[PDB]
Amino acid sequence: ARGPKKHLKRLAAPHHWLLDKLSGCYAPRPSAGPHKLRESLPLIVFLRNRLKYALNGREVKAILMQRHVKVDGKVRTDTTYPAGFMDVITLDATNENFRLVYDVKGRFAVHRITDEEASYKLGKVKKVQLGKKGVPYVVTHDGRTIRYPDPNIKVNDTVKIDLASGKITDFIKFDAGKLVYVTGGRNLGRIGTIVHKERHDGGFDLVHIKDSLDNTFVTRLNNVFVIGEQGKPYISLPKGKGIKLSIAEERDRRRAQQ
Amino acid sequence: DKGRFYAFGRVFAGTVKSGQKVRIQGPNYVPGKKDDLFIKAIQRVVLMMGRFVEPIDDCPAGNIIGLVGIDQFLLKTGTLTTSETAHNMKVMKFSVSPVVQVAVEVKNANDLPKLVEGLKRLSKSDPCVL
Amino acid sequence: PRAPRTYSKTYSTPKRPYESSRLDAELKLAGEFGLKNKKEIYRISFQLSKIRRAARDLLTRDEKDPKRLFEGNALIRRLVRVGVLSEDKKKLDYVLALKVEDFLERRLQTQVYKLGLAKSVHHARVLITQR
Amino acid sequence: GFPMKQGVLLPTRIKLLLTKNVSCYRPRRDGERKRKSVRGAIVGPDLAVLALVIVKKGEQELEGLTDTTVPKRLGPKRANNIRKFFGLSKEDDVRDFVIRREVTKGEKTYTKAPKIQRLVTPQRLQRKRHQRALKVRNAQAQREAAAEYAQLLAKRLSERKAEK
Amino acid sequence: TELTVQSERAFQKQPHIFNNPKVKTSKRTKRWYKNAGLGFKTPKTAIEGSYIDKKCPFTGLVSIRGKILTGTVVSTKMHRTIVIRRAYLHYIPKYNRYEKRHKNVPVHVSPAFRVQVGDIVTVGQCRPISKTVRFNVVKVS
Amino acid sequence: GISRDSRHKRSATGAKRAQFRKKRKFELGRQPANTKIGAKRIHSVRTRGGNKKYRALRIETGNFSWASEGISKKTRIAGVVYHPSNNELVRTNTLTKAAIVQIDATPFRQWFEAHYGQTLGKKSKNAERKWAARAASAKIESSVESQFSAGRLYACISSRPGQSGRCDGYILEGEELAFYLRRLTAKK
RNA sequence: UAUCUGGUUGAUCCUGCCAGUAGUCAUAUGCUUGUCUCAAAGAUUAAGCCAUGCAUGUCUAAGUAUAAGCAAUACAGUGAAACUGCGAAUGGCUCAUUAAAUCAGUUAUCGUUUAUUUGAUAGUUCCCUACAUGGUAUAACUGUGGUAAUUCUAGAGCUAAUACAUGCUUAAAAUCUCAGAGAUGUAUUUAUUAGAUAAAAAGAUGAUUCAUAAUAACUUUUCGAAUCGCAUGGCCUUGUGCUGGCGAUGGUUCAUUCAAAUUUCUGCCCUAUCAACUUUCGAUGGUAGGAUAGUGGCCUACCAUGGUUUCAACGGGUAACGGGGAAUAAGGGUUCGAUUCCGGAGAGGGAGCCUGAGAAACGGCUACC
RNA sequence: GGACUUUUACUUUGAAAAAAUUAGAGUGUUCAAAGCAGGCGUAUUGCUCGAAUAUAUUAGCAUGGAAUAAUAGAAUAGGACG
Ligand SMILES: [Mg+2]
Ligand SMILES: [Mg+2]
Ligand SMILES: [Mg+2]
Ligand SMILES: [Mg+2]
Ligand SMILES: [Mg+2]
Ligand SMILES: [Mg+2]
Ligand SMILES: [Mg+2]
Ligand SMILES: [Mg+2]
Ligand SMILES: [Mg+2]
Ligand SMILES: [Mg+2]
Ligand SMILES: [Mg+2]
Ligand SMILES: [Mg+2]
Ligand SMILES: [Mg+2]
Ligand SMILES: [Mg+2]
Ligand SMILES: [Mg+2]
Ligand SMILES: [Mg+2]
Ligand SMILES: [Mg+2]
Ligand SMILES: [Mg+2]
Ligand SMILES: [Mg+2]
Ligand SMILES: [Mg+2]
Ligand SMILES: [Mg+2]
Ligand SMILES: [Mg+2]
Ligand SMILES: [Mg+2]
Ligand SMILES: [Mg+2]
Ligand SMILES: [Mg+2]
Ligand SMILES: [Mg+2]
Ligand SMILES: [Mg+2]
Ligand SMILES: [Mg+2]
Ligand SMILES: [Mg+2]
Ligand SMILES: [Mg+2]
CATH class of the missing domain: 2.40.50.740 (Ribosomal protein S4, central domain)
Incomplete structure (x- = not known):
């Protein structure tokens, strides 16, 4: 009560980011920004927890102060700045760009794109x-x-x-057929087509989805992102290509590389 | 605060520092045996004033200080050493004697435990009362 | 405060304390494998029970239950990976059969004696112990 | 030691609740209206010190009166607080009349001066222009990007008007 | 409601709806109504009546958003508001058996509807409109 | 506090509840303005979010509206005649929403002349060419004309002086005036 | 991981309990205690009391520097004090209160406030300055001081602003308005209007009084940049003329984000040696207003006689904060959860209140106990 | 889109049920409790797999089923059908 929480306790932080239980006590609380706290992924996570360009938190607030870094072109020095779905990040050095995209297991993924075409x-x-x-x-x-x-x-x-x-x-209009991305639910992070709209007035619009291997599933509408014409993704897409696979299917692909 | 006491006295040799494997030796103990002896820690050392007790980190030999956290191991007196075999200290021959006695018990029976504890606490208060 | 460490008990004590049958059958296993405590025995029978616990719980699921096949392999994959399940017995529910002895056999302490190398299982233990 | 409240009208001493005016506000932050004691505005034998302000002089000087002559300690700092401290109008462009002050330590000693504020200068003039200029290029881009929209006023009223 | 409607000491009329006495469109009092949504539509008793009821889901300035519930009218005794009884079975896991429970729901009833005790009824959640009322009625079965 | 919580207040079963948690500021209420006639006076009140809100007490220069024509001329208010909440306001002449008042009404006669001109109840040329062009626009009701002969006109407030400071009303017309008339002379 | 044994008899078979047995992230305590890893810990009793110390302050290129501070031609580096800004409403602790309350899951705001972030967004102002307004003023500081005493403050003398208080600076069309001078933004408040969307003839939504626009007026007239720092390019008709670039701070509105406040459905332990309860003093509802950020008996006036209960109301008890969870588990169950996360409540007990976007705050103030 | 399938119970599936804990796949923390790490070779300017999955009972949401178990369908026809 009495005001807005400035803190975030670890284990109150989303599982997306995959931080160690023990480590320290706190998580980084995403600032106010464009997406949402739970769906964001602050800068400090990205620079240090996947790229591992930073070790300290003190490092990112020492590398962002370089203005080494930009999201949607703008520079963004705030260490705990909330970076979420679909944005891009050019970097001064490394002539290297990323877009923030989910893998199939629902967490944000590292993914690189051209010097151009990160322009959009x-x-x-x-x-x-x-x-x-x-x-x-x-x-x-x-x-x-x-x-x-x-x-x-x-x-x-x-x-x-x-x-x-x-x-x-x-x-791209939202219509039967168009390619989609799943952004919520147990099926968060999958791709493919669109096959129905249960209109459900007053309620939740569930939306039936079929993927490349013909697996039905339903997600409520605010868990779907229309992502262009089928087979022609309007955005450069990370190598997993968002399709899901059985837990037994995953085991076999490991034993392939004996 | 109620009933705790500063161990008061004089550093003759060595130094006292807050936290210390002091050996507390009562006037029964001898350096051979294990006797009126306790090897416990010195919580703090402070120098005494008139209700000022400004605390202090340590104190050298030849001075006057109080120790806290020692009292519970002391009946009336004692020598503190850190040698494996340092002896006790002389027993302070004084002049008066606990000769004029009286009898006590509590007005209210429930209070006897607070009385028997109190009599141990009073006997620390003074160097003479039996 | 930061998160709790999780911890678990590795062992489980018998129910009837003075059945000589269990007392003797335990002591045979001690001198044979050079153990000291019954804890060493108890830990293993608790492991073995924590394992049949999963095993009977999978045979109740009808064949082709993706969970049954998946952890059924995962189990036996881990059990001939140690030699406590023999290679042929990789079939499904030969697991329910193991006594503790198959584990004490695959202990490091026993091999250092069953591979020459020790002349006695009690000599094996201290050989391991002393770097 | 208790002070006298400017208007209370008592010979006695009493307690009031104080805002940011007179015997308060500090030391504690952000109001915070501590209740302190004050003393009346009318005088009586119980005082220790009376503060009197000399207004007229009379016959014989006093040694705390004439000889004691302490100075103003700071000179004007606003351009127009300097300008009309002497009568110089907008047409005198100070930085020539700002007072200086000397100090001697290591014998260059060169003076310190107060940095006039309200100063008529570029880029106070430049930023004034740069501000009003920005108003328009945005307004003109606003005005013209606004109309650029209404050419789909044609095509999308040419699939419902040119659609037979 | 009765006494035309002007039994109340305030004049009773829909807000911002104009009976203008300089154009004699002979309805002589405009009737603002809205289709409630969610399927059920405005009864002709609502379009054509002349009650005021700022709480009517059709005549009034009040909207229907939340749950829609079915209860059975058990009291019909306060003005423009009734109470219904919703019955159900609660599940007691240990006995793997059920016990009959029931809550009561005070519900505003717009004078579009005549309703008698009995009468299964359909209600939808609207904004808090009294201390105990958060539901308004839409059907009669 | 003057608290707005339901947590005083017996539950629907008739049962006295307990006091968990002291009054919180976000459930406060304040005292009414009880705004009177004359000597225009308003007080800022600092409401939640920093937002201000203007407390009328002694207002007199009250805007209005007609508004079968949409006229809205500022005019004096002279008294209150009827209130449907209690008649202890008509005799304290305290103005709130839904009160019924007498307003000066001359700025409306002196706009009726301006637009049309008759008036009740006994200079360029761009206006003459629109003067009798506007016709059939001087049909008052017997209800409303009969008042300028007395001068003061019967209007009802629609604003909230305690909140908005500015108090502005409209003028009674139709059965609205008929209804409120059958109680002014029903009291009489 | 589905086990029982001892004890009533002279003996028997039973009922049936006492005792035994095994675990307990379950407290305590006795004897004993070498290595490594891990790590609960003044909850229970007394939400009893507290000596001392610490626990919240904060500075950039970029609000204010004349320190009589350092270091050496308005200022210019570094920079204590003070002003200004921001923060102190998070955190941490505790579980006293609380039994339809809290809480969990599930709804709702077409019932509201919202610092901040992010994104969009603003030519118009006089009834004699804009090359730039006032002291409508003062801190630090100088100096004169009171008190046994506090983070007490007075009296006299200066001077700043992104502090306080002000207010002039515009085109180009039209619509009005007297062959052509002035008024035309925004927000406050009211009322009327459009917001079509079912064929032939004189924009959104399940749904709105929605978004938005229009008319007529209102207002103690809300915001609409007299602010900083870094640069200095361009113009010729070479003048503190005219121009101009990358940033910082600020502001009305809308969106957004962090929030919050209310809120729909269902769900609590023991107790009838609690069976009726609520309503004069709001109990359930109706109209009206008042009040609020806003719905609402939240309060007031008027009216009506309602609302809960054996499908257990009301009352009593809890050695009760809810929950995720912990112990024991053949299966079913039994017992617990003050305590690492979440929600909530409190800061000796009550009430009140200032500040602020946010507190009915307690390392804030006021009063009583 | 204008009139409703009388309306419920039950049951199947799906989304829902924070994280941790539990179950549980992977990984020689030297084993283990754990942790969510880690794995493959060059006298160095790299390569690469993970951070699963599940039970998450109720109540509510979406849904397939139409047995079981209730309930309304015209009898003073004021009834269906036009
Ligand atoms: Mg301050
Ligand atoms: Mg059993
Ligand atoms: Mg016998
Ligand atoms: Mg027993
Ligand atoms: Mg036991
Ligand atoms: Mg012990
Ligand atoms: Mg060692
Ligand atoms: Mg303590
Ligand atoms: Mg305690
Ligand atoms: Mg807190
Ligand atoms: Mg902005
Ligand atoms: Mg002056
Ligand atoms: Mg002054
Ligand atoms: Mg209990
Ligand atoms: Mg109302
Ligand atoms: Mg309690
Ligand atoms: Mg409990
Ligand atoms: Mg227990
Ligand atoms: Mg708990
Ligand atoms: Mg307790
Ligand atoms: Mg603790
Ligand atoms: Mg907590
Ligand atoms: Mg509190
Ligand atoms: Mg205390
Ligand atoms: Mg308080
Ligand atoms: Mg606090
Ligand atoms: Mg404190
Ligand atoms: Mg969980
Ligand atoms: Mg585990
Ligand atoms: Mg392991």
């Missing part, structure tokens, strides 16, 4: 209203309020962003 970002539209003085705007999933949108784009769709300004370049 994707985003799901969740709000379409009329602004003050009649100026229509959309809201993406990263807090971007983008004005003058192509009319009859409409909610649940996705939009390419040019990252020079908040420019909307193209848009």
Whole structure:
């Protein structure tokens, strides 16, 4: 009570980030930003816990102060800055870019993309209203309020962003067929098609999904991201390609490399 | 605070420091046997004033200080050493004697435990009362 | 406060304390393998019971239960990987058969005696112990 | 030692609850209205010290009166607080009249001066321009990107008007 | 409600809805209504009546969002609000058996509906509208 | 505190509850403004979130609206005549929402003349060409004309002076005026 | 990992308990104690009391430097004090209270506030300064001091701002308004209007009084940059003219994020030697207002007579904070959970309140005990 | 889209049930309790697999089933069908 929690206790931190139980007592509490605390992945995690470019926390606040680092082009010195789905990160050195993408097991994955074509970002539209003085705007999933949108784009769709300004370049409608990414649920992080909408007014819109190997599943609508035409992913995609496999299937692929 | 006591006296040889494998030797103990002896720690050492007790980290030989955390091992007096075989210290021949006695018990019977504890506590208060 | 360390008991004490049958059958296993405590025996029979516990619990699932096949292999994969399950007996529920002796055989202490090398299992133990 | 409240109108001593005015506010932060004792505005034999302010002089000087002559300790610092400390108008452009002050330690001794504020200078002028300029390039980009939108006013009213 | 509607000491009318006395469209009092959503639609008793009831799900300025529940009307004795009884069986795991339980629910009933005790009824969750009422009725079966 | 919690207050079963937790600030309420007539006076009140809110007490220069025409001329308020919550306000002439008041009404006569001109109840040319162009727009009700002969006009408040400071109302028309009329002379 | 044995008889078979047996992240305590790893720990009794010390302060290129501080041609480095800003509402501790309360899961805000982050977003202002407004003022400091005494403060003399208080600076069209001078933003508040969306003839949603726009006026007139730091490029008609770039701080609104406040369904241990309870003083509901951040008997006025209960209300008890969980487990069960996470409550007991986006705060203030 | 399948119980599946704990796959912490690590070769300017999975009872949500068990269907037809 009495105010906003500035702290995060380890084991209160999401399993996404995979931190050691024992280590220290606290987790890094994501700042306020574009995505959400639970769905974010702060800078300090990325630099030190997967890349292992940093060892201390003191290192990242010593490397971000270099302005070595940028997400969506902007520099972002805040050590505990909340970086989530679909953003990109160029780095001054290493001539090397990443986009933040889930693997099949639902955690954020390291994934590299070209110097160009990190120039663009994707985003799901969740709000379409009329602004003050009649100026229509959309809201993406990263807090971007983008004005003058192509009319009859409409909610649940996705939009390419040019990252020079908040420019909307193209848009994919949300319709039966389009390729999707799962962003929630037990099936978080899978890809493939779209085969139904149980409309369920007043309630949750469950949405039936079929993947490359023809596995049915359902996730509620706010757990799906429309990601372009089938077989033609509108974004560079990490080598796992989000398809799921049996727990017994995974064992065999290890014993292949005897 | 109620009933704890500073062990008070004088450093003659060596130094006392807060936390110490002091050997507390009562006036029964002899360096051969195990007797009125305790090997326990010296919580703190402070120098005495008139209700000031400014605390202190250690103290050399030839001075006047108090020790805390020692009292519970002391009946009335004693020598503290860190030698494996240092002897006791002379028994302070004084002049008066516990000769004028009286009888006590508690007005209320429930209080006797607080009385028997109290009589041990009073006997530490003074160097003479039996 | 930081997270709790987890810990577990490795052993389990018998129920009837003075059945000579168990008292003697235990002592035979001691001199044979050069053990000191019954804890050394108890630890192993507790392991073996913690193992049949899983084993009977998988045969109740009908063949082709993905969990049955998956940890059924995982078990035996770990049990002839040590030699306490013989290579032929890799079949499913030969596991329920093992006594403790197959484990004391695969102990380091016994091999250093059954590979020449020690002349006595009591000599083996101290040979291991002293670096 | 208790002080006198500017208007209380008592010969006695009493306790009031104090805000940021007169015998308070500090030492404690952010209000915080400690209740302290004060003494009345009217005088009586129980005082130790009375604070009097000389207003008129009369016949004979006093040695704490005439000879004792201590100075102002700081000179003006706003441009117009300097400018109209002498009567110089907007047309005098100080930095020539700001007072200096000397000090001697190691014998270059060169003076310290107070850095006028409210100073009419670039880039106070430049930033003033750069500010009003930004108002328009944004407004002009706003105005024109606004209309760039309404050319799909045509095409999407040419699939419902040019659709037969 | 009765006495036309102006039994209350305040004048009773829908807010911001205008009976303008300079255009004689002969309805002579405009009737604002809304389709409630979720399937069930406004009864003609609501469109055509002339009650006020700021709490009516159709006439009133109140909306229906949460659970929709079915109970059976057990009391019909306070003005514009009733209470229903929802019955169910609670499960006692140890005995692997059930016991009959039941809660009561005070529910606003817009004067669009005549409702008698008996009468299975369909209610939907609206904003807190009294100390005990958080549900409004939509059907009669 | 003047607390707004349900946690005093017997539950629906009739049962006195216990006091867990002291009053929290986020469930507070404040005293009413009880805003009177005249000598316009308003007090800022610092409400939650830093947001201000203006406490009318002694207001007199109250905006209004007609608004069959949409006129909204600031006009004096002279008294209150009827209140549906208790009639202890009509005799303290304290103004709240849903009170019924007498307003100056001359700024409305002197706008009726301006637009149309008759008036009740006994200079350029861009207005003459629109003067009798607007016709059939001087049909009052017997209800509303009969008042300028007395001067003061009957209106009801729609704003919340305690909250908004500015107190603004509309004017009674239709059965709204008919209903409130059958109680002003029902009291009489 | 599905086991029983001793004890009633002269003997028997029973019932049936006492005793035995095994575990306990279960406390205590006795004897004994070499190595390594791990690591609970003033919960229970007394949410009893506390000596001393510490536990919250904070500075960048970038709010204010004339330290009579260091180091050597308005200022310029470094920089105590003070102002300003921000924080102190997290953390940590404890489990006293609390039994439909808390809590868990599951809903709801078409019922609200929201610092901050992030993203979008703003040409208009006079009823005689804009090359830049006032002291509408003062700290530190100088100096005169009181008191046994506190992080007590007075009296006199200076001077800053992103402190406080102000306020002028504009095009280009149109719409009005007197062959053409001025008024036209935003927010506060009201009322009316559109928000179509079922064929032939004179935008969103399951749903809205939604978003948004329009008219007519209102206001003690809200915000609409007199702020900093780094750079100095371009212009010729070569003038403190005119221009201009990368950053910092700030602001109205909307979105967002961290939040929060309410909130729908279902679920608590023992007790009838608790069977009726609630409503004069709000009990259940109705209209109206008041109040709130906002719904609501939250409160007030008026009215009505309602609301709960044997499917256990109400009352009593708890050596009761809820929960994830712990112990024992053939299966079913039994016993626990103050305590590493989550939620909640409290800071000797009560109440109150200032500040602030956030507290009914306690290492804040006020009062009583 | 305009009128409802009388309406419930039960049961199948799915999403849901934080992390830790438990169960449990992997991994010579020298074993083990653990931990979520780690694994393959060059006198060095690298390569690479993991951080599973499950039971997470209720109540609610989505759903397939239509036995079992209730319940309404016209009898003063005021009834179905147009
Ligand atoms: Mg301060
Ligand atoms: Mg049994
Ligand atoms: Mg016998
Ligand atoms: Mg027993
Ligand atoms: Mg026992
Ligand atoms: Mg012991
Ligand atoms: Mg050693
Ligand atoms: Mg202690
Ligand atoms: Mg205690
Ligand atoms: Mg806290
Ligand atoms: Mg911003
Ligand atoms: Mg001055
Ligand atoms: Mg001054
Ligand atoms: Mg109990
Ligand atoms: Mg109300
Ligand atoms: Mg308790
Ligand atoms: Mg409990
Ligand atoms: Mg127990
Ligand atoms: Mg607990
Ligand atoms: Mg306790
Ligand atoms: Mg502890
Ligand atoms: Mg806690
Ligand atoms: Mg508190
Ligand atoms: Mg205490
Ligand atoms: Mg307090
Ligand atoms: Mg505190
Ligand atoms: Mg404290
Ligand atoms: Mg869990
Ligand atoms: Mg385990
Ligand atoms: Mg292991």
